[PDB]
Amino acid sequence: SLQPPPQQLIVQNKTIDLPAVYQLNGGEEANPHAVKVLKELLSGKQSSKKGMLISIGEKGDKSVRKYSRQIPDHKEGYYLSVNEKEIVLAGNDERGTYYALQTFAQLLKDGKLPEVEIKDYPSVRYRGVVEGFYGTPWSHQARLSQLKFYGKNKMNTYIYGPKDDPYHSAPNWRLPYPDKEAAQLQELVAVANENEVDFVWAIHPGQDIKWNKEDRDLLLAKFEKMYQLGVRSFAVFFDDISGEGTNPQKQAELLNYIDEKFAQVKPDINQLVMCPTEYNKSWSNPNGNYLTTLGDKLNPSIQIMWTGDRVISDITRDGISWINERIKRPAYIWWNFPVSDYVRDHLLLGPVYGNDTTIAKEMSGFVTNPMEHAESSKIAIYSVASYAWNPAKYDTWQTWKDAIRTILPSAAEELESFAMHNSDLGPNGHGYRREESMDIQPAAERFLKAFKEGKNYDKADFETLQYTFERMKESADILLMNTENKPLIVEITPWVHQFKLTAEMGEEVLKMVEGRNESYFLRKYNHVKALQQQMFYIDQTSNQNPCQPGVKTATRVIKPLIDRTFATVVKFFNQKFNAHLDATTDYMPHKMISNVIKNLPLQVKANRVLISPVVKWAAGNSVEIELDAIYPGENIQINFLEISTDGKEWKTVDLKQKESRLSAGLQKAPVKFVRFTNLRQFVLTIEKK
Ligand SMILES: *CCC(=O)Nc1nc(OCC)c2ccccc2n1
Ligand SMILES: [Ca+2]
């Protein structure tokens, strides 16, 4: 599967050997980055004045003069030909030549090539990745790896804008990078250039920019320092800010000044891009002219970015028509997937889909905002590269599989098994979801209805569930030990552990359903309870980020199936044997009781213990939380109060107020019980770890 698939391809059912003796024409006149690829591929073979002719060059070079009519007249276009007589690798321009060699490399298998003729070019002018997320920015080693990946997949754009880089954003955007970081950035630029990628350095100054001479000049001096490090494309982002920096006329004037005084004065600046403050339809003022002001005032060579109809959105024909009318140019898409920076407890390893495949002419560019997990994001990146190059031939499912096979050839089926059940976001404030576990969902839902009611489930369905859990454990164990992509495995490991425990829990729960005798059932029950505790421990000790800590996996179908089946089989057991087994599905070491609320589960997040968010609260009614030990208390925050260490001797804590927010410091007071007498928020913070 050539990826991206070329615009035009004609294959014969005929094969030639990569020639043992070859005559190279154009080695000194073609793109040296393409020539390097070709020479690596011909490493074994003999350069002669006789032997099979291989011609490499750009249109205008002597080497490819015979083939000038076959070369597409498109930016980054190429013509590739292999037949028994000769090989031709001819770009319309130097990057096109490089791209011809990336296609050529995929054609070559077991020292053999198909007889083929290809004419190829990208449908979208700028294709790539915006490292534009909140969280731990990609490591330098991760970035190196990404740039090589981009060249292989014909992505020509890498926009550097990690929100947590203080020399990119708040507070130190005005300052030059310190020496260590500057040398790293210089190396990234060099490697980008070697992989035919434009390194676009972005700046995000808007939260405290002053519309005065001093800050204008400081921005330009920072761009100049980045130009000294080799940067030749630049962006200015005004997303996710408030205040004076949101002014569109001033934004447009700044970008125009950058254009006039910098981008028009250097010999070799390529992209100049801005991200607006109103960067999706839902954030656009209905009766405001923010977007029309940018559209009319911004110099027409300057690109304008757009995330779609919402912050997290798929791009439609109606949506892109809507923006294009107002900005007076084709939008440069900023696609917010697989970015997980608002659902940091989930990996998003599913296919890329949802974007209209007929709107290439309506977009200037398409870049993906990835996860902070760089290797894991390659699944989606590979897919976006395929989409943006040839959207008319974009096959979501086959591209997903191809990506996985590319990224982890040694354990591709195991990675697919894992990714199939790690693709949904769970519930979130952006409303954005993806499909997950679709294949087993029918068997899961049939089984669970039959089970709940008074019905024999289908043996096949039970077996499909067993098969799934068995395969999950195989995939987890194989992935954990895989050393072909060690950085990938480091990223996903906490989720792999959680996924394996999920599968184990599933297996034990099905053994509870198979219901042979009382003492066996209880053994399975006790084992499930232990596995629940293990899953709680992973959740509290892994991926303890400040936003959405912990580790969730197989959340759409699998975990709900297991949890519902467990609750049901425990209910039946209690009914049948007059027992009182606990039917709770998530382990929770702390306890809460209430007359009101009563069945809202407690959560533990970092050093917070909280009740899960109209409630009718009678007089003298109370909520009581018992912790599992005595801890020093930090504070209590409540949004519509006593503490103790033994439950008997109490002490009152007076809440302060500002709007609906109630709060009180506890000054390290020992706390085991918290009681309120007479909910968007109920959170105790303790001293932990
Ligand atoms: C958990 C991290 C988080 O919420 N990050 C975040 N930060 C900012 O502000 C940058 C200082 C932000 C602004 C607007 C929208 C979302 C945001 N998320
Ligand atoms: Ca040339």
Author numbering: 4 to 599, 602 to 618, 622 to 648, 659 to 696, 706 to 716
What does the paper say about this structure?
We have used a glycoside hydrolase from Bacteroides thetaiotaomicron, BtGH84,17 as a model system to explore activation by small molecules. The catalytic domain of BtGH84 is homologous to that of the human enzyme O-GlcNAcase (OGA) which removes the N-acetylglucosamine post-translational modification on serine and threonine amino acids and BtGH84 itself indeed functions as a generic hexosaminidase. Using a bacterial glycoside hydrolase, BtGH84, we demonstrate how small molecule “fragments”, identified as activators in free solution, can be covalently tethered to the protein using Michael-addition chemistry.
We noted that position 2 on the quinazoline ring of 3 presented a vector towards Cγ of Y550, positioned on a flexible loop above the enzyme active site. We designed tethering compound 4, which we predicted would undergo Michael-style conjugate addition to the acrylamide from the free cysteine thiol introduced by the mutation Y550C. In order to direct reactivity of 4 with BtGH84 to the desired site, a triple mutant (Y550C, C420S, C654S, hereafter BtGH84_TM – signifying triple mutant) was expressed. In the absence of an inhibitor in this structure the active site is occupied by ethylene glycol. Compounds 9 and 10 attempt to coordinate the water seen H-bonded to H433 in the structure of BtGH84_TM-4, potentially stabilising the conformation seen in this structure and reducing linker mobility. The quinazoline ring is seen stacking onto Y137 and pointing towards the active site, with the amide linker coordinating a water molecule with Q551. The varying position of the tether in these three structures demonstrates the flexibility of the linker, however the fragment is in each case centred on the π-stacking interaction with Y137 (ESI Fig. 9†).
